[PDB]
């Protein structure tokens with residue numbers, strides 16, 4: 001899983 | 014009522030996406046002023062196209078890395094950008110930004126590709142599809158002339174797109190449809206199931222009513238689309254499988270980290 005990038009992209013950009 | 018929602022979602026859509034059905038159809042037939050797409054129908058024309066699209070895949074050892082991997086890379090790029098526009102679109106969705114971030118990155122994980130192949134149908138026709146923002150056009154025939162399994166990847170997308178484009182949906186239908194696919198309250202690992210569901214009921218309803226007035230004559234279009242949601246789901250499954258193969262029987266075609274985690278523990 002992790003998804004460290006999908007998180008970084010939901011913040012604001 | 015929820016109609017101010019329909020327009021809400023549609024505005025976010027028109028903003029977050031660079032290419033849309035409207036432009037796609039004008040390009041894929043209609044010259045008008047000018048700018049007829051360069052056709053990549055074989056290896057020569059492929060290299061001709063890359064020569065411009067890189068100065069990176071034309072003079073960097075990549076000018077001669079199997080064509081299948083070069084292409085796999087360009088599609089990879091389109092996914093990354095689209096997954097990116099897809100994230101903003103979802104956040105601009107009433108309710109999405111109020112959910113737990115983990116449920117967000119859960120809806121995006123399972124709906125992102127269903128969305129991709131849906132919107133990609135817009136730029137496809139029975140003979141091929143637009144590439145590079147509508148500047149190029151790669152033939153359906155050239156893609157099946159590749160070695161396996163690369164030659165088996167798009168054919169299913171073309172069959173789905175031909176049946177899907179017959180429904181003649183426009184951009185407004187697609188925005189709601191895409192929101193409906195993304196806000197699916199049946200995804201795995203979903204924490205706050207309860208809410209995501211009602212959210213779904215909302216947009217689906219809105220969509221039902223929208224198609225009902227926008228396409229009064231296609232009568233059973235809403236149910237047709239419901240079926241196409243399930244179709245997209247299976248297409249994704251098949252595509253993901255198709256990639257796992259390559260990924261381990263074609264070490265030269267690596268996947269972008271963003272896409273790496275989406276596929277990662279998917280189906």
Ligand SMILES: C/C(=C/C(=O)c1ccccc1)N[C@@H](Cc1ccc(OCCc2nc(-c3ccccc3)oc2C)cc1)C(=O)O
Nearest residue numbers: 081084085087088089091092143144145151163166167272
């Ligand atoms: C990683 C990956 C590979 C994949 O699907 C493939 C590889 C090899 C052969 C056939 C298919 N596919 C994606 C999902 C995807 C995105 C975009 C897309 O079309 C985008 C349109 C487009 N643009 C070009 C192109 C542009 C410039 C030079 C050469 C080719 O080609 C295509 C099909 C098709 C499919 C995924 O798993 O994330």
